[PDB]
A = this chain, B = another copy of it.
Amino acid sequence: MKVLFLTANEFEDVELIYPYHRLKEEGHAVYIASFERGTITGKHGYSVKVDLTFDKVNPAEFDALVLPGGRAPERVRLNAKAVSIARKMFSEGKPVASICHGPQILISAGVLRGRKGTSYPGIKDDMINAGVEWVDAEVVVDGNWVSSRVPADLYAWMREFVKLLK
């Protein structure tokens, strides 16, 4: 499968790097999309190369979506093209994985009312106001939506997600 990541500077480093490698283990192709080509740098100083910009993404060409956390989702969610990608892929029923602040992008896409999931506890009230049935669990599977809360949850986050790509 082709797996797309939406992110930017100040991503939470391990929430990007862990799924990136865990999905390559399975043989999937992984793509990093951001505002500009070049490199982006995490909160803790790991740098990754950007594969394409939001403007060049055709959502039809990707099979699954990963939304890491950090401070990056508060900037990505103000980009109409990035929010449009997540709206389309989530509403088409493609697998979507989010963790920590990552679902702020789905809040802004307007796709979450009635869905069941989790997030960083610091934004649970915002999830609830977007209509989420919010659950305090290390991983929640709701149809195509796999969500987790914090870096401690990584093992469970990707355990469930990889099942949906098989």
Contact = CB atoms under 8 A, between A and B. Distances in A.
Nearest to A42: B44
Nearest to A160: B25
Contacts of A13: 13-14, 44
- A-side binding surface: helix, strand, loop or mixed? helix
A126 B130 CA distance: 8
Given A44-B44, A44-B46, A46-B44, A155 B107 contact: no
Contacts of A25: 155-156, 158-159
Interface stretch (A56-64, A72-80, A86-94): A72-80
Contacts of A108: 125
A126 B78 CA distance: 12
The winner among A13, A25, A159 for most chain B CB atoms within 10 A is A25
A154 to B, nearest CB: 4
Number of copies of this chain that the complex holds: 6
A72 to B, nearest CB: 10
Interface residues of A, number: 33
A75 B14 contact: no
Contact of A17 (B14, B74, B126): B14
Interface in A94-121: 104, 107-108, 120-121
Contacts of A125: 77, 104, 107-108
Interface of A: 13-14, 17-18, 20-22, 24-25, 44-46, 74-75, 77-78, 104, 107-108, 120-123, 125-126, 129-130, 151, 154-156, 158-159
